[PDB]
Amino acid sequence: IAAHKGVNQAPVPLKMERVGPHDVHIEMTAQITDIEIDKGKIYKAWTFNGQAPGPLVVVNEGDTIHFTLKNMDPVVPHSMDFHAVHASPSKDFIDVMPNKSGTFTYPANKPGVFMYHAGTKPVLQHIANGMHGVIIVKPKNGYPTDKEVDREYVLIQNEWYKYNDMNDFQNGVPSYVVFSSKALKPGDPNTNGDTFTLKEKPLLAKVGEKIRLYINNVGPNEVSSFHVVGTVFDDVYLDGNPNNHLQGMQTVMLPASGGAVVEFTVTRPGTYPIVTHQFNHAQKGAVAMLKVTETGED
Amino acid sequence: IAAHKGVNQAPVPLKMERVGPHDVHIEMTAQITDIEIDKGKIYKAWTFNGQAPGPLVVVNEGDTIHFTLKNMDPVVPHSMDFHAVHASPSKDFIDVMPNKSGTFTYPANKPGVFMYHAGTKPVLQHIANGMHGVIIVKPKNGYPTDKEVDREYVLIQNEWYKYNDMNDFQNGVPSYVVFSSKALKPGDPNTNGDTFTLKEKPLLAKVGEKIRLYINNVGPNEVSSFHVVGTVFDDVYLDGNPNNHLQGMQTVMLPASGGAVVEFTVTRPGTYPIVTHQFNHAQKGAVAMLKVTETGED
Amino acid sequence: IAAHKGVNQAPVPLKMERVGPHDVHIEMTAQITDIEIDKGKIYKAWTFNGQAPGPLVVVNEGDTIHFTLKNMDPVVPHSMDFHAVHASPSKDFIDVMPNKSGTFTYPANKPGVFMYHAGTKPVLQHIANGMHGVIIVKPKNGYPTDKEVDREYVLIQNEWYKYNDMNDFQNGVPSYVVFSSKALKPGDPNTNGDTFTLKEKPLLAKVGEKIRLYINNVGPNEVSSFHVVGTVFDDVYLDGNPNNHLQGMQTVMLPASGGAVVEFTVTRPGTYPIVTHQFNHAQKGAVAMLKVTETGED
Numbered sequence: 087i088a089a090h091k092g093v094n095q096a097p098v099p100l101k102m103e104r105v106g107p108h109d110v111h112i113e114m115t116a117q118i119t120d121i122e123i124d125k126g127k128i129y130k131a132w133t134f135n136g137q138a139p140g141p142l143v144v145v146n147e148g149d150t151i152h153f154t155l156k157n158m159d160p161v162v163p164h165s166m167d168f169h170a171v172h173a174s175p176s177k178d179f180i181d182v183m184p185n186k187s188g189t190f191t192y193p194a195n196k197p198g199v200f201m202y203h204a205g206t207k208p209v210l211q212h213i214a215n216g217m218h219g220v221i222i223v224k225p226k227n228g229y230p231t232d233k234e235v236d237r238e239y240v241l242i243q244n245e246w247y248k249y250n251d252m253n254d255f256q257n258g259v260p261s262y263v264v265f266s267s268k269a270l271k272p273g274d275p276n277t278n279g280d281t282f283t284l285k286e287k288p289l290l291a292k293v294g295e296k297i298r299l300y301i302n303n304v305g306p307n308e309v310s311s312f313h314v315v316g317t318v319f320d321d322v323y324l325d326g327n328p329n330n331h332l333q334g335m336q337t338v339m340l341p342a343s344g345g346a347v348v349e350f351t352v353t354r355p356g357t358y359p360i361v362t363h364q365f366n367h368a369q370k371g372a373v374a375m376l377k378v379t380e381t382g383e384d
Numbered sequence: 385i386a387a388h389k390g391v392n393q394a395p396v397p398l399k400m401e402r403v404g405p406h407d408v409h410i411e412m413t414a415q416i417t418d419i420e421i422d423k424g425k426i427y428k429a430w431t432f433n434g435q436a437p438g439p440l441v442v443v444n445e446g447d448t449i450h451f452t453l454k455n456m457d458p459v460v461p462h463s464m465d466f467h468a469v470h471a472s473p474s475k476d477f478i479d480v481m482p483n484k485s486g487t488f489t490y491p492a493n494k495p496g497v498f499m500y501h502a503g504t505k506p507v508l509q510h511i512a513n514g515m516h517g518v519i520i521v522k523p524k525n526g527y528p529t530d531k532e533v534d535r536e537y538v539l540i541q542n543e544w545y546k547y548n549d550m551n552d553f554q555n556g557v558p559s560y561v562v563f564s565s566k567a568l569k570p571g572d573p574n575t576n577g578d579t580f581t582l583k584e585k586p587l588l589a590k591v592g593e594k595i596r597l598y599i600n601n602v603g604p605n606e607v608s609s610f611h612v613v614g615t616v617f618d619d620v621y622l623d624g625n626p627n628n629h630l631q632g633m634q635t636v637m638l639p640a641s642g643g644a645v646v647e648f649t650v651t652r653p654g655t656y657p658i659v660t661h662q663f664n665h666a667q668k669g670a671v672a673m674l675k676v677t678e679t680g681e682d
Numbered sequence: 683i684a685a686h687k688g689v690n691q692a693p694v695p696l697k698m699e700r701v702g703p704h705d706v707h708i709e710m711t712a713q714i715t716d717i718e719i720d721k722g723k724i725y726k727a728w729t730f731n732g733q734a735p736g737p738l739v740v741v742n743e744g745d746t747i748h749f750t751l752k753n754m755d756p757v758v759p760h761s762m763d764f765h766a767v768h769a770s771p772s773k774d775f776i777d778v779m780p781n782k783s784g785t786f787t788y789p790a791n792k793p794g795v796f797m798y799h800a801g802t803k804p805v806l807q808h809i810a811n812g813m814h815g816v817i818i819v820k821p822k823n824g825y826p827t828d829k830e831v832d833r834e835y836v837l838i839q840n841e842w843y844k845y846n847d848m849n850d851f852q853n854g855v856p857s858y859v860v861f862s863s864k865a866l867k868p869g870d871p872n873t874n875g876d877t878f879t880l881k882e883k884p885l886l887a888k889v890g891e892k893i894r895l896y897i898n899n900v901g902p903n904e905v906s907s908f909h910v911v912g913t914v915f916d917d918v919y920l921d922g923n924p925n926n927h928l929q930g931m932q933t934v935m936l937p938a939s940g941g942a943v944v945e946f947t948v949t950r951p952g953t954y955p956i957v958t959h960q961f962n963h964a965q966k967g968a969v970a971m972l973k974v975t976e977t978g979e980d
């Protein structure tokens with residue numbers, strides 16, 4: 087895109103603040119940012135806030151979100167669709183033009199781990215170019231296993247294709263399939279979807295801990311067969327809804343846009359790969375590492 | 385197929401009648417019919433009754449079906465396999481030759497949303513050419529959420545490939561992935577699997593309604609990540625069996641031939657896309673529209 | 683691989699023995715063996731014990747497995763990952779070098795139908811070349827439907843690609859998708875993943891029986907839409923965990939590495955195909971036959 091040539095906008099922090107007991111303001115940007123998706127390979131991504139996937143949003147069940155999108159792209163319109171909310175797509179997920187802003191208000195009344203993405207036609211183009219992320223809606227009454235959990239992380243799976251190639255997006259195999267992690271607190275890792283970061287800088291844990299991961303497969307096109315090597319999921323909650331509760335799974339099937347909360351134990355020290363078990367995708371990048379030490383540091 | 389050149393058989397209505405409290409007669413045809421699957425693109429489909437997917441069949445749990453197939457194809461044999469029934473495939477799903485008829489009897493003793501299709505080798509060829517559909521078996525005791533439901537529709541997802549090309553069927557990506565809707569009553573829309581009808585003529589609803597969709601992904605080859613934009617499914621029943629009950633899902637994973645009953649609320653007026661969230665397939669046709677008005681008309 | 687040219691190692695029996703009430707010794711080989719995967723087509727497979735998929739392992743919930751792998755491959759290292767166990771992947775799933783042995787100890791504390799495979803980088807290469815199988819962990823308290831079951835079989839789905847072709851493994855469609863069956867007792871069939879054996883030599887049953895199948899889709903890359911023609915699954919237990927219980931399904935979605943216990947009735951005599959309903963894969967080999975007779979023999 088000629089107007090994107092030499093555009094590289096620096097990442098903007100997510101702006102959030104609570105304005106009432108069940109009302110929250112969120113402000114995000116649409117912006118064009120270069121991300122290194124594999125060693126030596128830059129993708130000029132269409133992003134929220136200069137991250138792909140975008141920043142993590144965490145709200146509580148029953149919050150109303152008053153959301154503002156500032157479009158920094160000089161030519162392409164962008165929009166936001168949150169899977170968490172009930173809204174009118176043709177009134178509330180509409181396009182925000184270049185250098186313009188839009189504000190929208192809608193409720194999050196279901197707990198879970200939800201995809202968000204741009205809703206601008208062709209949606210495939212916006213998702214594939216990087217406009218995806220996750221919003222977590224915390225359940226009012228928690229999960230039944232909350233007392234047993236020691237440590238929490240967020241992981242997101244996405245694909246990358248040949249740059250802005252609609253034929254490849256529609257008809258091709260992914261070039262790369264990747265994990266990223268987003269921070270539930272400062273001090274947690276917060277990364278972009280790339281083939282290497284979570285191998286070189288693993289997630290940490292301590293021997294004996296019960297780990298909770300909040301996971302979402304944003305696609306755009308593939309399903310995921312999510313598995314942690316060396317363990318079995320003790321509990322699974324499909325889409326993060328506490329009522330959707332499975333036990334003792336080896337692997338969790340996730341549709342495109344599907345989420346889960348998964349919990350498992352790590353019993354021995356060592357390095358534990360995290361994969362999609364569709365091993366063509368794992369080979370193309372989708373392996374993250376969990377390093378489990380006798381202290382929880384390293 | 386040389387004997388199909390210039391054959392275009394007009395659609396025949398489904399013939400059904402109840403002959404006892406738990407016995408029902410159904411008569412269907414196998415016939416060759418041109419269907420416009422995308423603007424300007426005719427597919428000479430192998431069909432039941434001149435529709436692809438075929439006509440909707442609705443029976444009650446515990447009905448015995450006395451089914452007749454009349455084969456109008458002048459050269460190719462066809463057969464019927466209903467997923468709803470218990471039967472002997474080699475005695476009851478057998479081929480009916482050209483210009484011949486066959487009658488078969490079998491029970492439907494499980495509730496749900498079931499695929500039907502031809503069982504004639506190679507089955508892939510018959511399904512891909514259009515010989516698929518859905519049979520709904522109503523549960524004797526209903527669903528637990530029946531009192532909350534305001535409006536019901538049936539949607540079916542299928543793929544189309546290059547015309548009668550067994551290499552493409554086996555090894556290729558779909559050319560088109562489409563939705564259709566079938567009528568649960570006269571006045572409901574009843575359409576074929578095409579890229580456009582349910583965009584140009586949306587399904588209707590009224591603000592505030594709880595909507596039930598009975599859905600099946602007939603394939604032949606792909607899985608589906610079924611999602612309604614702007615809402616969250618309040619309740620899901622896998623394969624339409626009332627015992628298989630999930631809540632608060634964003635997206636429902638359907639195998640090839642898999643079904644579901646899904647229920648959701650629409651809270652604001654506007655146009656609500658209905659997608660598979662495998663967005664390469666949505667881009668290739670699989671977007672239907674739900675128009676929600678302040679009165680339920682337009 | 684030049685050191686594999688003319689290597690064809692004969693199949694070795696699985697060596698197992700119980701050494702305490704909750705301790706079991708298993709000894710397996712890694713070996714190179716020619717298997718006929720389709721008529722006229724030999725694949726020089728990388729195998730456990732000269733079978734692909736490997737031999738069935740059955741243990742009880744809470745058993746500790748003391749596992750030895752003898753690597754008979756003259757050049758390539760191999761390793762074992764059992765999905766059933768809790769272990770440290772970097773200490774317990776490590777490579778065993780050529781002509782060397784390794785012993786590892788880990789517990790199986792969850793019931794179900796679990797994949798096993800090599801863990802040697804690149805894992806995709808080892809799985810695709812044939813290093814996969816299933817371990818069944820029996821539940822201490824059985825399944826709730828155990829009294830109703832008449833007959834049990836194990837079926838495994840896998841893919842084959844162009845021989846040892848990493849480009850094809852990562853980017854290509856499968857050449858063949860196949861079922862095999864493994865014996866739960868001597869007298870049961872025990873076969874390799876090929877396009878023909880379970881068509882030419884069907885599984886047997888008797889009219890009226892409730893059949894239990896323990897199934898796993900080992901991949902490496904595809905999902906499975908598992909279906910028995912002519913029946914409906916009465917009960918399904920996802921991953922073989924008795925708590926994960928669905929009823930009345932037509933088709934079961936399995937991720938890559940996913941398992942299930944499924945149970946169904948066969949009401950009439952005849953031949954009942956067993957398929958993945960992703961019919962491109964069924965066309966490429968994944969159809970097995972169940973022959974149901976008035977006596978249970980033939």
Ligand SMILES: O=N[O-]
Nearest residue numbers: 111152153189191
């Ligand atoms: O309360 N609206 O930003």
Ligand SMILES: O=N[O-]
Nearest residue numbers: 313315316361763
């Ligand atoms: O065992 N997981 O690759």
Ligand SMILES: O=N[O-]
Nearest residue numbers: 409450451487489
């Ligand atoms: O009762 N048979 O058509």
Ligand SMILES: O=N[O-]
Nearest residue numbers: 167611613614659
């Ligand atoms: O939010 N659905 O595309």
Ligand SMILES: O=N[O-]
Nearest residue numbers: 707748749785787
């Ligand atoms: O008890 N170890 O083989």
Ligand SMILES: O=N[O-]
Nearest residue numbers: 465909911912957
């Ligand atoms: O009805 N199964 O192909």
Ligand SMILES: [Cu+2]
Nearest residue numbers: 105110111152
């Ligand atoms: Cu406000």
Ligand SMILES: [Cu+2]
Nearest residue numbers: 164204212217
């Ligand atoms: Cu965008």
Ligand SMILES: [Cu+2]
Nearest residue numbers: 167203343661
């Ligand atoms: Cu979406």
Ligand SMILES: [Cu+2]
Nearest residue numbers: 403408409450
């Ligand atoms: Cu009759």
Ligand SMILES: [Cu+2]
Nearest residue numbers: 462502510515
């Ligand atoms: Cu046909």
Ligand SMILES: [Cu+2]
Nearest residue numbers: 465501641959
């Ligand atoms: Cu079928």
Ligand SMILES: [Cu+2]
Nearest residue numbers: 701706707748
């Ligand atoms: Cu020992």
Ligand SMILES: [Cu+2]
Nearest residue numbers: 760800808813
């Ligand atoms: Cu190996």
Ligand SMILES: [Cu+2]
Nearest residue numbers: 363763799939
């Ligand atoms: Cu594995």
